[PDB]
Symmetry: D2
Subunit: 313 residues, 4 copies
Amino acid sequence: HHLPNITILATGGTIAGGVENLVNAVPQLKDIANVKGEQVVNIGSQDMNDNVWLTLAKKINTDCDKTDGFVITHGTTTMEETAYFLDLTVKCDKPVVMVGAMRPSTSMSADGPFNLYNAVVTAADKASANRGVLVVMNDTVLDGRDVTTTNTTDVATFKSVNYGPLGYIHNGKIDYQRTPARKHTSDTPFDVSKLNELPKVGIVYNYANASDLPAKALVDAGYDGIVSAGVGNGNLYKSVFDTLATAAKTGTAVVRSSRVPTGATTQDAEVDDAKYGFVASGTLNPQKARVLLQLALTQTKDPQQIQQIFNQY
Amino acid sequence: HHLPNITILATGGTIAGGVENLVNAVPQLKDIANVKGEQVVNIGSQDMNDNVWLTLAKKINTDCDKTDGFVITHGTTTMEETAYFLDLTVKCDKPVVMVGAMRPSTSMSADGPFNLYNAVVTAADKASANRGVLVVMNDTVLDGRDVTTTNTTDVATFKSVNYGPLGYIHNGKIDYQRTPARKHTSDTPFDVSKLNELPKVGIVYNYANASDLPAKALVDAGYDGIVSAGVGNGNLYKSVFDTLATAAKTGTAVVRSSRVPTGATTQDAEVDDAKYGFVASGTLNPQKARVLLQLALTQTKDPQQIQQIFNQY
Amino acid sequence: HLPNITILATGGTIAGGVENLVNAVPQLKDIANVKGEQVVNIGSQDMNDNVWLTLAKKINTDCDKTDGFVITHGTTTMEETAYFLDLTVKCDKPVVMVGAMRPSTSMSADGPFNLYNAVVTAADKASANRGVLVVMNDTVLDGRDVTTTNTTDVATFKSVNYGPLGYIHNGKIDYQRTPARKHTSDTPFDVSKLNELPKVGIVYNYANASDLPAKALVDAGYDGIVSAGVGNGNLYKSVFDTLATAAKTGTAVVRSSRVPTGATTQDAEVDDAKYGFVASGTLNPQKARVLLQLALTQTKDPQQIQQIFNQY
Amino acid sequence: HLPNITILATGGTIAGGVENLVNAVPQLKDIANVKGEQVVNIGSQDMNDNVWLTLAKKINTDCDKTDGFVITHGTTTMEETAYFLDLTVKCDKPVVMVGAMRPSTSMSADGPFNLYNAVVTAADKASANRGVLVVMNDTVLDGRDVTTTNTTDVATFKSVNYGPLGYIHNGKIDYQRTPARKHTSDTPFDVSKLNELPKVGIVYNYANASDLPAKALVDAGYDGIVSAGVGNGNLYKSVFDTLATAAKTGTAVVRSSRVPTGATTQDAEVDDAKYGFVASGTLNPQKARVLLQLALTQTKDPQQIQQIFNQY
């Protein structure tokens, strides 16, 4: 019979070819779906922020019943953060698919048009429901939790570096062989429909001879939470460790992640988490650990509980 | 005729099996070289710092004539930083080889013994001279500039993620097919033999809704230089960009690197470097960009000159 | 009350006979009651159909007598045996394969810790119902996707298209994935009455390829030929012509690829419908052989072989 | 004064005949004076010895008439042609190969930007003396190590053992590496008088492997056989016995590996000295064929073939 209705929510510039005119930039979209577009905000992905996240999640939650699936156009710099936020806060189990482009739309061999096409194909496929928020880039379907950018410029940068992709797309057909095991979307307790702001969580970097001043500035300003981008398996330079130990004793939530791009920051391996009240991020990298910590702090300030959240989501 | 003399400088705990007794932990070392060991410092790699670096570089430079090659035992967390520092400051063109272990020496299938063996094999091979400071891990020879840790726990974590390894080791023989093109060791102008400290350079992280407070703390404390771990191709969150723009106008050196684990942060692509007085790090990740910036600042505070250094070393 | 784990050996020892293992790796005692048995003693590179049938029958038979199985197997052909077992084992208890890239007498031998992690894996209840597993280098990999990516590296084993199922740290496994394709007790393949498998060989494509290998297999009456194609399963002209003719005579022909990752997709490069060819999807040539052998025990029709290739 | 770059085409067009290219990619005009010529018109999967000899002769002949060459070639066998040219081209001007993973009429076709970057590469003086290059997905790769890693991905081309030579950003190349093995004008191989190459075929190893492919090649008088071995170049028993016998009769036998990265090392698994076998090092089977063909134009002694395999 008929084609699904897919809504395209844009957050920034056009990635192909005016969100209302996408069907004229990529006319092949008409054969896959009845497409409607809305510009929700217009900003550079590098300036992505908590208000945009709250706005997007509310919009998807409210409009879930009116459409068969969503495609979100988003810049590549912070795609991985936005995707995990929505993966935790969207209560709609219809396909929510994010997509961007590594090359500008006017450039030779621009990747955006085919990325957009494939994203609409993903959002229109019934098998894509109930898998969480998805990122479609370079002929691959990736889950919002594991997905990250691995290269500054490559069209193939987006990968799920720990657990792999969910599926591959070839000629408008998707071979799914995986689905994420951690809880997402409608299975999480996080509800943002009444929040107009989120807890303050910052990130500090570790390295040889690291200054403690970044950590001290965040504590002095009353941050709710601090993520450490540790060295190796979440290790801290001594002055950073002293400042964070004190902070965690006096009510700051402290998550140990790693600057190292793959693998888990594991619980009491290098550092005695139970003694200091620290939380280990597992496979969440620093920027994703921030997202989960922010949301955890809307429900609890207890480190043992926060740790359990980091083991479930 | 006879075996080379190799000196093993240790910075921390034993990686096999007491630096003087390594020849009893790995007796096969005797067949490859006449080995001597010295404990230079004893610290956790996560607490690595500028004084240790200055001490190591002086020691290698002074002792260069007394030995055929050096092996340095070092923890894995900051190996990649220490290696690049020495790659720029060591004036000895005999093999300088760093080595560590991802598993403790008492654990089942400890990687250290064979890593140590292979490191001594590398340091004893005449073909290893004139290639810069080398890291030997998991049967692979890696140059100190490109080498980084890719996984929190894997024995195979060390990779040269942009340009690849220099050689592979199989049965005590190395097949070298590459050598680094950027200038190293005795071809650089950096000389640390008279320095008892280095310029202050810190790192700030970018992410959605990033605080500018870490950057402001470093500027207020008079840091000489700031490396930004940007999003994508070295992009900055707006408040971080405003603070750094001001800082660079008033004499702080500012290098744009990326949190993204591979690829170059390229010069005037995303950001107008010439307008703001910023320097693009190319393929140096944030912690390595710090090392080069520190050394650049012992010779110049001019951004155009600093950029040229970042294009040569 | 520790689980009972059976170790079935197929070759030499990977740590330190088969009942010496608890002496070689004393930490095993703390995690399982281990019993060992030497099923065959063969080098992995000489792995064959008989060993496969034997292993599947032993596991299917002893399923109710133990809580899980660890099979010690050499690394060269581990990926083939693992997938065969993945399709033919009807025990849904953990079945975990393990080997070693370095010999047991070498410095920093990988076998002991690998063996220890394999037993940890087979003893964990969360490992059941995931199909046949390979445990190497602290990683838990599914039998369909796992392949060896490097000739000598201890980290060689990877699931190159869809990734691992779990990682192991201090004896605990973080499972975040399970394979979607049907395995073990969900397959129709039953080897309990078979003493032999259909004959399936493999030919390689490259520039200026001889069609002689393909002709030698056709002339010998092979039931099936898998092509290790160039790119997206393409064939050198002369090999193509030999295989189009054999397909018309009822030889089953599967297009796979010499290229180490990605699917050989259906009807994209070659018109499979027209020549009666089957596309392997993500199965590399040696894995596509395994499935084709089994498919041929149920059917010789290409369209139904294609569907099997789309479900298992 | 822009460089003169010649585009030699071997098949269809990768952007948009061969002189239409400057209309298809107008930005080329700003970086080079481009002349095009269609040397053959063949699908990459049917690539053969004749096309190789022709391309090497054309480049060797026209070397002094142009500043660099771009060769448009289909992706399936690009890695083979690139290495053949790398050993036989005596022009030390840039020779750059390029192709496309998506067809020119598809959405987000990769050929135009690839072609543009290839011409950029051939026009840059820093590209000379690095041997024959492949330029794909903003990356500059050497002809010996480059291989295709995925069946469909635009990013498929990688130098999987030693990495790329350079990356291209906004028309500038950051070169940080050059290949150490001898190439182009440093090799002894000269194809200028040859109308044919020695016959070298490829056999695959796997569990329960037939020795029929190997026998079909021996019986036909092949000069050389490359084995795509399991693990570190191992051979299934029956294939081993067939090839040990052929080696004794003077067939040249090279052990390579089906495993996609790492070296097939000398005397490690198999005693090469004793059977007269040669180990391929990092050359995969299809690349090892190329070098073996050329080695056989100078010598039939295994020890000297081994040395060639250790130098080129």
